[PDB]
């Protein structure tokens, strides 16, 4: 966990490197059952 | 608390059909799950089928299925089981039990049998219904003496047997009916009793043969 962090006075900014990535590209999609007996 | 009343046992012939009754008193039959087992002499019981009139289906043992039907009448509260094409294999006591069906959801099935009948014997043979005869076994001459009666020739089984109009019980011995080479049934019932009370005493057996519609009240006591 090695986090670099770099502040530039020209434009007041800060930027925060070292972060990795973990986006959410896709969907998985399962059927969940239960079964029941009606009285 | 409640009694399940079969119809009565009887012989039919091979390849005829056969229709066996089962009264229910004190409850409806809708209430219940009605099951029909036989027992073969010397096997276990089996399960043909039960109905379930709180749902109205009908469920049969694959073996029994296509030739054994069962209805349950809700105007009279009995239940029915026909057998067809009856052959020597059938002979067995068929059983008429219960399970209670009060809280039922749909596709409930026959779990267990808590009531049951009395059973039904069927026999299916060529011999005709014969009543039998009742012979008296007499006592004579340490402190204890043997009477009794016998019953001899009838079919089928079973022929029933009470001392005393079922009063005198402990010490009765009625043996399973032996088959004669003759044919027909035949059997025994012998009860102890003190020697003190051969004269003042009286012994009746009281032996029924329902299938014949035979019923026999034989004094026992010496002779001289």
């Known amino acids: 966990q090695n986090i670099t962090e770099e502040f530039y006075q020209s434009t007041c900014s800060a930027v925060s490197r070292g972060y990795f990535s973990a986006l959410r590209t896709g969907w998985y999609t399962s059927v969940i059952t239960i079964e029941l007996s009606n009285i | 608390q409640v009694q399940l009343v079969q119809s009565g046992a009887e012989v039919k012939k091979p390849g005829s059909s056969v229709m066996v009754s089962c009264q229910a008193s004190?409850?409806?039959?809708?209430?219940?799950?009605i099951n029909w087992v036989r027992q073969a002499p010397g096997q276990g019981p089996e399960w043909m089928g039960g109905?379930?009139?709180?749902?109205?289906?009908?469920h049969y043992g694959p073996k029994f299925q296509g030739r054994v039907t069962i209805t349950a009448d809700e105007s009279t509260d009995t239940a029915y089981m026909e057998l067809s094409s009856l052959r020597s294999e059938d002979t067995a006591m068929y059983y008429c039990?219960?399970?209670?069906?009060?809280?039922?959801?749909?596709?409930?099935?026959?779990?267990?049998?808590?009531?049951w009948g009395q059973g039904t014997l069927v026999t299916v043979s060529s011999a005709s219904t014969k009543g039998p005869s009742v012979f008296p076994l007499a006592p004579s001459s340490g402190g204890t003496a043997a009477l009794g009666c016998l019953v001899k020739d009838y079919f089928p089984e079973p022929v029933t047997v009470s001392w005393n109009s079922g009063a005198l019980t402990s010490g009765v011995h009625t043996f399973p009916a032996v088959l004669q080479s003759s044919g027909l049934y035949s059997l025994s019932s012998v009860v102890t009793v003190p020697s003190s009370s051969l004269g003042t005493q009286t012994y009746i057996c009281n032996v029924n043969h329902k299938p014949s519609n035979t019923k026999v009240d034989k004094r026992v006591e010496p002779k001289s």
């Open positions: 039990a219960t399970e209670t069906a009060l809280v039922v959801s749909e596709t409930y099935l026959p779990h267990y049998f808590d009531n």
């Open positions: 004190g409850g409806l039959l809708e209430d219940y799950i």
């Open positions: 109905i379930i009139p709180v749902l109205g289906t009908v």
